[PDB]
């Protein structure tokens, strides 16, 4: 956690380090276009400090050990960098969503959320199976009282090759090929229509040019981090001889917590980061700075056009 921090993390720091006060703040403007600032930015987010306060101080370095609660590195960022990240995902239905709107649906729901709502976040979560059972598996070994575990697996991370690792990506979370996202009926009607996203990012509905670029970002929203992990704690984080690996921070963990590079990731806002208000100082057309006088009258021209205000 050091050394990962100490270079390679001097990079989060201070790119994100600064301006992560420019952007996050109780997640800025909800619900328009700043779709990762709702969320996937709670699990990422919290990575940055995070930090000192939860993983490198006290968080499976320092003492120790710690972690608390199962490390507190495992059973926090490791599900909540999945689950609790995509299960506050409804304050993303409410965008990657009413792009357009399918409008209204009938007389109901057109208050998109609520039935779907769970029929949509209690999808994109549902690897919350770990949460249950794999987190059963910090629970003996007790993810405090051995610090983190060792030991008492052998039976069987053989025979329960199911609930474990390879089990929360299976096939679970092959969701956004087989139906989700575009199973909206609007989502059949965005991306996959050049009917959108071009006109409409342009200058249309939306914050711009990068509302542009989520003709293909967007599948960058919901596939990045938490679907492809299973094959990445499938080897490893299960068996070889408990403390050395697991705990096997070493590769394993690396890639989840780059997420502190809040700066590709912030890159992709929209209507928010430009027509943003308050921390006009993020990339734009006049760039690295307005002009964004603000209000919040649609899209945003470049620059301050289309319209003041």
Known sequence: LAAYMFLLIMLGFPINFLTLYVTVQHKKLRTPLNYILLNLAVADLFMVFGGFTTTLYTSLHGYFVFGPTGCNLEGFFATLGGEIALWS??????????????????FRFGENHAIM????????????????????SRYIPEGMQCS???????????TNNESFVIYMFVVHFIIP??????????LVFTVKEAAAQQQESATTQKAEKE???????????????????????????????SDFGPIFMTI????AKTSAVYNP???????????????????CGKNPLGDDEASTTVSKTETSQVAPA
């Not at 990731?265 to 990339?283: A, D, E, G, H, S």
Request: charged content about 10%.
């Open 89 to 106: 995902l409804v304050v993303l239905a409410i965008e990657r969503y009413v792009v357009v709107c399918k409008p209204m649906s009938n």
């Open 211 to 241: 509302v542009t670029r989520m003709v293909i970002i967007m599948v960058i929203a919901f596939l990045i981090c938490w679907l492809p992990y299973a094959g990445v704690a499938f080897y490893i984080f299960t068996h070889q001889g």
């Open 117 to 136: 709502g769970v029929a949509f976040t209690w999808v994109m979560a549902l690897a919350c199976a770990a949460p249950p059972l794999v987190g059963w």
């Open 265 to 283: 990731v912030i890159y992709i806002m929209m209507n928010k980061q430009f027509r943003n208000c308050m921390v006009t100082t993020l990339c």
């Open 148 to 158: 983190c575990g060792i030991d008492y697996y052998t039976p069987h991370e053989e």
């Open 177 to 186: 090929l087989i139906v989700i996202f575009f199973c909206y009926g609007q």
């Open 252 to 255: 394993p963990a690396f890639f």
